[PDB]
Amino acid sequence: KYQCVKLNDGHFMPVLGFGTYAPAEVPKSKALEATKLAIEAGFRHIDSAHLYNNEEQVGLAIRSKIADGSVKREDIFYTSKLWCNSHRPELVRPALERSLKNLQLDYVDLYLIHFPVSVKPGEEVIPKDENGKILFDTVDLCATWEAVEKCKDAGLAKSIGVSNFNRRQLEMILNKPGLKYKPVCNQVECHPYFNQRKLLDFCKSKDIVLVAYSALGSHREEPWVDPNSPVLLEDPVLCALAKKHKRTPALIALRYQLQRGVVVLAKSYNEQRIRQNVQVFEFQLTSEEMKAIDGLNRNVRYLTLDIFAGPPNYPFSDEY
Ligand SMILES: NC(=O)c1ccc[n+]([C@@H]2O[C@H](COP(=O)([O-])OP(=O)(O)OC[C@H]3O[C@@H](n4cnc5c(N)ncnc54)[C@H](OP(=O)(O)O)[C@@H]3O)[C@@H](O)[C@H]2O)c1
Numbered sequence: 232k233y234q235c236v237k238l239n240d241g242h243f244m245p246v247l248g249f250g251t252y253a254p255a256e257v258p259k260s261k262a263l264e265a266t267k268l269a270i271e272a273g274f275r276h277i278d279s280a281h282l283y284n285n286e287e288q289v290g291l292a293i294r295s296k297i298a299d300g301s302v303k304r305e306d307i308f309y310t311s312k313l314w315c316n317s318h319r320p321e322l323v324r325p326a327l328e329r330s331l332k333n334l335q336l337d338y339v340d341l342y343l344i345h346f347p348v349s350v351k352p353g354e355e356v357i358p359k360d361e362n363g364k365i366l367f368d369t370v371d372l373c374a375t376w377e378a379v380e381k382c383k384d385a386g387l388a389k390s391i392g393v394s395n396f397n398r399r400q401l402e403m404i405l406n407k408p409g410l411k412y413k414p415v416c417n418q419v420e421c422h423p424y425f426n427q428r429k430l431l432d433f434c435k436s437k438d439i440v441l442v443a444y445s446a447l448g449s450h451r452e453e454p455w456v457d458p459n460s461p462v463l464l465e466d467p468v469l470c471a472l473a474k475k476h477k478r479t480p481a482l483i484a485l486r487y488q489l490q491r492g493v494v495v496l497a498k499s500y501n502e503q504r505i506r507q508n509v510q511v512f513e514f515q516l517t518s519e520e521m522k523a524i525d526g527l528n529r530n531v532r533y534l535t536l537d538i539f540a541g542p543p544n545y546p547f548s549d550e551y
């Protein structure tokens with residue numbers, strides 16, 4: 232179960248991670264219960280973000296499990312993310328400090344730039360003008376990264392990384408004059424329909440971990456995900472693999488990522504499925520079965536985040 236990977240800064244990340252995001256209609260209380268369940272089941276990597284509006288609950292869950300002696304703080308790998316309304320250098324540490332206040336934790340294990348397109352500062356996560364048009368902002372992401380680096384210097388984040396960055400954007404950070412810390416990871420959509428071979432190879436080449444999200448084919452929340460997209464977990468090949476191994480399509484999709492050198496997230500707010508997901512460590516796939524899963528690639532991106540298209544930093548126009 233507890234398998235970790237060494238990050239490029241010498242910290243360790245558990246290779247299986249609990250996703251904590253739920254669609255807006257899901258009550259906040261559910262994040263609290265699910266996160267406790269997840270830790271009880273064996274999850275030690277917990278993925279959240281300021282965007283998710285659940286850091287009070289996830290923090291409560293984590294601290295409850297530390298209070299009752301189930302885990303120590305050093306046993307939990309907790310990730311947060313800097314939202315698009317706090318890309319300005321001077322807003323970076325206040326954002327992290329606000330997440331920490333909400334969590335009642337003294338540090339996060341990992342802090343990520345959530346998405347490379349900036350939006351106007353303020354309380355609104357998606358600011359719009361009086362006609363409903365998104366209020367984008369102009370911010371040098373290299374200046375953002377420098378402020379994120381200072382959060383590591385401060386001890387407020389053990390490790391730092393990025394999310395939804397393309398190759399060009401990784402290169403921008405990596406090649407920045409006076410770089411202190413490379414991103415330890417790039418957290419991106421990744422699953423058998425969209426298996427990110429080119430980006431995976433690039434991240435590998437730069438000692439950057441690829442962390443897969445929507446690894447089970449995504450929450451499929453409208454208007455974010457096209458309801459007409461094929462359903463990952465209904466895939467005939469994943470189902471046949473599941474039957475052969477006495478596992479589930481979900482477990483096949485998870486194991487796939489582990490065996491290709493990808494750290495993998497899995498969201499569930501269902502006690503049974505939470506408990507089931509940690510079984511990814513209990514079985515293996517052959518090289519032939521891995522090749523079969525490689526053939527499933529369809530160029531299906533579930534989360535285009537195309538409401539943020541237009542600005543130059545929109546990451547998904549490039550090939551990868
Ligand atoms: N950085 C970013 O921009 C970004 C974007 C998307 C996601 N993420 C992160 O990655 C996480 C996971 O991605 P996701 O939220 O799109 O969901 P996901 O992990 O791909 O899972 C999608 C759905 O699968 C169901 N599920 C879970 N285990 C299952 C199983 N064994 N069998 C059948 N169904 C199962 C869940 O429903 P139940 O809850 O009903 O089990 C969940 O709604 C997020 O929660 C978040 O932490 C980050």
Ligand SMILES: O=C(O)c1cc(Cl)cc(Cl)c1O
Nearest residue numbers: 252280282346452455534536
């Ligand atoms: O989970 C996320 O990070 C996420 C981010 C964005 Cl911007 C939108 C949706 Cl629907 C998400 O699920």
Ligand SMILES: [Zn+2]
Nearest residue numbers: 360361362363
């Ligand atoms: Zn007006």
